[PDB]
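Box 3.1. Reading complex inputs
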Amino acid sequence: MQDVVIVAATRTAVGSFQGSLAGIPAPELGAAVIRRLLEQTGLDAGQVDEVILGQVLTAGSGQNPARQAAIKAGLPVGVPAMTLNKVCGSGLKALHLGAQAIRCGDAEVIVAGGQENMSLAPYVMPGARTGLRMGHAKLVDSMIEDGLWDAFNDYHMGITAENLAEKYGLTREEQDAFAAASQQKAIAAIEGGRFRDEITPIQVPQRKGEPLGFDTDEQPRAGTTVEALAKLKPAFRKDGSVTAGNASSLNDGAAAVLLMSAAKAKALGLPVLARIASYASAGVDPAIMGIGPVSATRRALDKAGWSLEQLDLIEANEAFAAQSLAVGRELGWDAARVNVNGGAIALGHPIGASGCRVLVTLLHEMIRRDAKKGLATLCIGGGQGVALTLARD
Amino acid sequence: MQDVVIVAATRTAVGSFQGSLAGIPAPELGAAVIRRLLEQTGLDAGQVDEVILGQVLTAGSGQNPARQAAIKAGLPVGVPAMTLNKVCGSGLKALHLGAQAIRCGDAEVIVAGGQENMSLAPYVMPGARTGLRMGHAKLVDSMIEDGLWDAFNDYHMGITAENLAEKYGLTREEQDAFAAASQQKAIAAIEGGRFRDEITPIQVPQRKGEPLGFDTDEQPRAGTTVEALAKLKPAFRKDGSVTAGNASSLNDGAAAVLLMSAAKAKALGLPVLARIASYASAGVDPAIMGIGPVSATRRALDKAGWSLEQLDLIEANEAFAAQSLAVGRELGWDAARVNVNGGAIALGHPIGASGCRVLVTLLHEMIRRDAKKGLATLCIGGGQGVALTLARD
Amino acid sequence: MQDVVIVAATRTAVGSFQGSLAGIPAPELGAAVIRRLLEQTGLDAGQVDEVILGQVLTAGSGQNPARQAAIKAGLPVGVPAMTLNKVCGSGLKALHLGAQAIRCGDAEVIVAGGQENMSLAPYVMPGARTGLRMGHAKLVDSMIEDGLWDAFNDYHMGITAENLAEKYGLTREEQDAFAAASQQKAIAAIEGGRFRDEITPIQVPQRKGEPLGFDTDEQPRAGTTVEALAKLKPAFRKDGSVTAGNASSLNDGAAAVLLMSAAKAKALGLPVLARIASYASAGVDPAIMGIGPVSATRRALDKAGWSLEQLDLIEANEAFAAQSLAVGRELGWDAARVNVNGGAIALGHPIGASGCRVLVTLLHEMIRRDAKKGLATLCIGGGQGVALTLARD
Amino acid sequence: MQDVVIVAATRTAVGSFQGSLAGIPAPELGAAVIRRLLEQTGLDAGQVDEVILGQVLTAGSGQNPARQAAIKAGLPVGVPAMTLNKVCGSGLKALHLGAQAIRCGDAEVIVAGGQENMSLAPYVMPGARTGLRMGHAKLVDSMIEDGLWDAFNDYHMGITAENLAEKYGLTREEQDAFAAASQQKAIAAIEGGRFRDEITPIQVPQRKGEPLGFDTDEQPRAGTTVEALAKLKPAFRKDGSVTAGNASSLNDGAAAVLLMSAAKAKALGLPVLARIASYASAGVDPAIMGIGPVSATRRALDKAGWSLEQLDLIEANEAFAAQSLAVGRELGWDAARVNVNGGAIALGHPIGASGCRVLVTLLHEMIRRDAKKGLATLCIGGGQGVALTLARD
């Protein structure tokens, strides 16, 4: 069996909804991060064994979005590719599948991550194929239906967040305070240059002129305070506490890593950024999907033989302030080690990419701080979680 | 690393386009086959570690089709699930992923396979979200765009078949002969009860009355003859050889297997139906995607330590007669051992399920013949192939 | 000023929803009745001064449906045409506009009537032009929105019928009895050949074979009784009395007359079928639009100098049994003189044509019985009415 | 038979496509002009006998757009209303219908004109009702299909303009000169306050703030020059002369007049702005529909007993410079008396309102010039024309 290492890790800056990446299909964002990984390592494209990319919103995307990213990146036709959907966890579960293929010797080199363009997710017209017959019909927002709506309880992810606010007695004010601190940390990280190493610029075609470079996360909102956030109306339930300001946003982006066997990295003479110590999935009740990270984290820590207090750094994707605070209540983690450069409330949640986006952020901040142990974890719509651990010597 | 064994294998009958399963969402087809695997083995649903399902056409399907099948089958919320898309190969690649998880010790019990309802694939309206502005616009058939259209060359899978007919000099007459034999063999197998053991009936809700059981493959065309096939118009190109009669059809169905470690099967007292001896993916030129099975097959045989001559029985998915003939010409296999109960020209190509559909059909025929060594292989839109080997003592 | 006469009058048989005329656009139904009027009179097409046709549902119908009917009928490009919309009254109001043009000497010969294909009325997608942005959207049934829904009260025409059932204390049983008698009278008229003279057959193109003649009204339902009708659920309101069986149906058809000055008819040597004695419109509260015929009838009788009891025959379009019984309560007419060959509950309500359809039925039954005075009247969605009187010597 | 007089005349400013009126449904534009006519004359709303409004694009507009304008303007439910469609001529034909009703003694007071919101014309999905079956389908721009496309020849109104440019040998340079002059004249009229007396302001709801008044025509393009027009690409045919700069635009607006018998105006003490001396329609070849004004004008002059040389002032709607030049060549009129404040190339062509828009502009200019004899004329898609004459003492 082989040990699995990361030799390159990169992401796009994260675009806002109908923002800077709104014209660029998800597989072109994937292609741009694949090219960068090969540039950073000087790796011949022929050395890649597989491309594994998460993407949730694939209506009208064409055959196999992961194959589109691989071909558009200039990888030869001989490199196989697959797309996966574990909703919000897709981009991290891609690394789990790549690690598995490398551990059992099916591959030595894998590109793994995710890509999502929520801006470009289309409307869908069920029933037009066979006949609507009569009566007004529903033109379905595929982003909501396929990305943000619970298939079992017939309500938004935001109601799952209301459920956790109730269960843990989390107040509006606690949720707003968490949201403001995420904003403050993201703006400080951006201004402090903490995202420069991890970001691949996208050359965005303009209406007129040469392309403009997009290289700076654009979701964070200056001047976010508990006082401004207190004015917002509840977004999902009349007397609710979850708002657009303490929830993650809608976003565009891609993120990927170059996985290898430790043996292959050494044979190529590539420096190792981190080893993968463990990975895990878990399932929970869809009604409280935001708690998925608790069991996923405990399983990953158990598989690595670690205790939570040994983690130097944690990236716990911020689907909703209520969801994040609920995970922190259950795990009893030190919040000062969690999302130290800000989280998805400030930076965005480009669903199928977020799992790899938070992993890339974790890895670069671990290198900066000389951290030895880190965890990436995400909740998943439909009631699941993923977690993955990274180690450095 | 553990042997990976199959302890149960089942599929729906395959429905024709707007046929018997046209009202049943893909995940309900998946739920029905997962329920049957547990019934056949008497396994408690809590013993399942993961559900891995292929499904290509997911526009408006809701969050995580695989998770929807797992929950609807009565698996507990604790069982994680993921959907994958390797287009035509999705349903077989799912067993490769399940094999990897078991070989790494990440799981002991995996449900793997695929599900597709082409009848229900909707229309998509790109640009409606941001504004069509003016001018007539294209309402996109997601079944064609996401399932049947090459993303690189902007033409139908059927043109890839024409490309193979031209390259191998495969005549209209040889393609129609292959298609007639597929029909004759499938009809003989159905009438002979050859598919009874492998089929899970679906109770189809009726507008009026108690549900009707669907348990008989409905795509095969009785009294097909070469003389009748000779009269059809080319389906994809003016002077082409590929027709509706020598191409696969549009279909609905699901298929799944219950994978275990050899150790777990022994501890439960479950008989081993077959061992997975190897599996592989390959990439080829998208323009001739139908040839993907050649290198996928050669890699899977190399990984098993087997020669082609050692295979007793082969299931090679029939995307098009031209594609199936080309693969047979390159590999030089004995056609008498290939698709002995008919293939997809007769039985249908429910894209994301086909990979597991042909594996289920391979396994049941291997048992009746006392075959020791079997191969399942598929071409994949976008220029890929998958192959997997079965061994019996 | 000129006196206005009818020298020819004809209609299609009325098609059921997705019935025999479901493939034939409204202007082709109009063209077929225009051709017949000219055949019946031997009139040179160049003698027509104008074509005035009602059509309500014109979404995607192309420029000026009335001009399409005129050109398709073979009338020269020199004949002007206009389309009008007075909803349910369009096909009778067309005769009012033609009568006005003839009375004041603007024209000597006019084709007037209406045409509707409700089967072909399309779905409409508001907001797609400028952007739906996010959220599920409404795909609008144009037939409901433009034809059957009140623009002021935001409810169906059927609620206006519930309002009249309340106001006049009309029971479910009274409404069902009216519906059954309409069915019985329509079937007796069809079987007795009372519609043969007034109907122009349509040659309906088939999937395979030569066209099939459609010449027999297909909406009437044999075996309609108060006992069968008693089983139906209320169609518009939970504890309501209006059902699909005591309401008019959805239908396809066209109907037109050839109007002339009495002077022009005499100069051409054409026999006069009837003179137009008077015409009128009225407005009422949209909430009780079904009562529109009361004031419209009184104004038309006043303009002709007639009393209601002088009418030998009345065609009062049956939007809903409640609506019809309410009009009869207000006017105190002899019900034995109303809709003697059945009404719209049995024969259908092809909205934009119905006004001329009931006029053509009135005229032919007046000739059969040697009636001297007749009235055609219709209620109109949005709260209006039309009425027109016919005389014979 | 009574003289028909105009006692009030007003129009909205004309909005550009997705400009100031882009959020205001056509019938609300109509309501605003009807309210203004009553305010200007101090007429009680109960004195109106009918509302006759043109509107071409009615897909999803709801029952009877004219009735919606009448009710929203505060006319009592007793006032009947009808919508008409004579495409580009609808807004003028409405006054012809109103004139006829008054000449026959059917009415004493009619509101007549037209209304259009092209910005709000929706997309249509033919075939969704009965089933698209498979294959990419056409989402129809109803503005193009129902407003701008010839139903007989299957090409744009702009090709009818090319047909006239070829037939009359009208150069690109002569078309651009005509277009530049239309722009220069409209801008001079706006800046001079020439349209203040004829315009009813619309209070436009704003996302945030009190409504903003829209009272200034926004289609005209300041600093238009022949040198700038010379650079534009042909809009309809590869080597054509018709461009976006020498064609009318897409627009939103409404216009209406208050018509009375001479007797009724006298009895109310209302001054007569003008008398309608005559009106006419004509039909021509759809391929050269732009020439419709020639025979319509000749018929209207014949009916008034006037020669072309007696006209002081002409409004000839500018569908295209090529179309306007062709009409001028055939009639031989003095261009200095035509569209003296600019026309539709500059001011816009809100299809169903244009007929009344140009009549309102004619009447206000006739008053300032003390013109005695005026003509308004329009070409009509489908091969028609309308013309109407105004007299002042």
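In summary: The two ends of chain A are 21 Å apart (CA to CA).
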